[PDB]
Amino acid sequence: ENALLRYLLDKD
Amino acid sequence: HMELTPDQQTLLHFIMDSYNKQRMPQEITNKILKEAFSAEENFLILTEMATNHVQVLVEFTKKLPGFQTLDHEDQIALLKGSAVEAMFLRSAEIFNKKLPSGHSDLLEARIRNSGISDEYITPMFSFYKSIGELKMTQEEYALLTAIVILSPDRQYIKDREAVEKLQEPLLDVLQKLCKIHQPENPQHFACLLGRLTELRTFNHHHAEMLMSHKFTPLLCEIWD
Numbered sequence A: 001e002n003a004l005l006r007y008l009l010d011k012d
Numbered sequence B: 001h002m003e004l005t006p007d008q009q010t011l012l013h014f015i016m017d018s019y020n021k022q023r024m025p026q027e028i029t030n031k032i033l034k035e036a037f038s039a040e041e042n043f044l045i046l047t048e049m050a051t052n053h054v055q056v057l058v059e060f061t062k063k064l065p066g067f068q069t070l071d072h073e074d075q076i077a078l079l080k081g082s083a084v085e086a087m088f089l090r091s092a093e094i095f096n097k098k099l100p101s102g103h104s105d106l107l108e109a110r111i112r113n114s115g116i117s118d119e120y121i122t123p124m125f126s127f128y129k130s131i132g133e134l135k136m137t138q139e140e141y142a143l144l145t146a147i148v149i150l151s152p153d154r155q156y157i158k159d160r161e162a163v164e165k166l167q168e169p170l171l172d173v174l175q176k177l178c179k180i181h182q183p184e185n186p187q188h189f190a191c192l193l194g195r196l197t198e199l200r201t202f203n204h205h206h207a208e209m210l211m212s213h214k215f216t217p218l219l220c221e222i223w224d
């Protein structure tokens, strides 16, 4: 799980 | 050899626009100036800088033409495999252009007194000088960053041909820009290629450095 990258990639 | 096509001009414009949106926050620059000159505070400052770069990298990458069209897993694979390379490339630009002479001298002082071994510090500063010598333009820093990021040879990529289709027109634009701006120097593209291979060596130095107050759980789980 690359939770931070996933969040930043699919943000705003 | 003479000019970029409207399509190459469009592609270059999107890379340039995305690359120029980045800025060092006031909070970070103020820390390099006023915080204590101890191994603890120096490493903490550098950790903050390393973290801020990851956010800058994701936002630049998201706006690269065709990145959004890649499979989700391949997008993650490209960011993971280029994060260290893109960090040292951006750091080279800031050290040789952005940072003021005095402020850069204080950051170099902080870097050299942050508990990191010379085995890592020496190639890092050697690479900074080697980049400075080339006198790279902003178009060259933006294209090089995009080429590094869209490397189709990174581990855990499923559809490599899709990344190949994205990287090939960037190498074409970069070579053409070398022929237009440095026609008297036919070895200019080759000098820029030399930086792509020098950047690859930083993957080992970084992973070997991470093996050793220096414990930062957030950055460790991104990198490896």
Ligand SMILES: O=C(O)c1ccc(CN2C(=O)C3(CCN(S(=O)(=O)c4cccs4)CC3)c3cc(Br)ccc32)cc1
Pocket: B022, B023, B024, B025, B028, B046, B047, B048, B049, B050, B052, B053, B056, B087, B088, B090, B091, B092, B094, B095, B099, B107, B111
């Ligand atoms: O806030 C921003 O906008 C921003 C943007 C880009 C950067 C990138 N950048 C870096 O990452 C370092 C080089 C690596 N070191 S390090 O010591 O090797 C290390 C410590 C912990 C893990 S890796 C950290 C600082 C650096 C130096 C100089 Br001069 C210019 C840019 C950078 C930072 C901030």
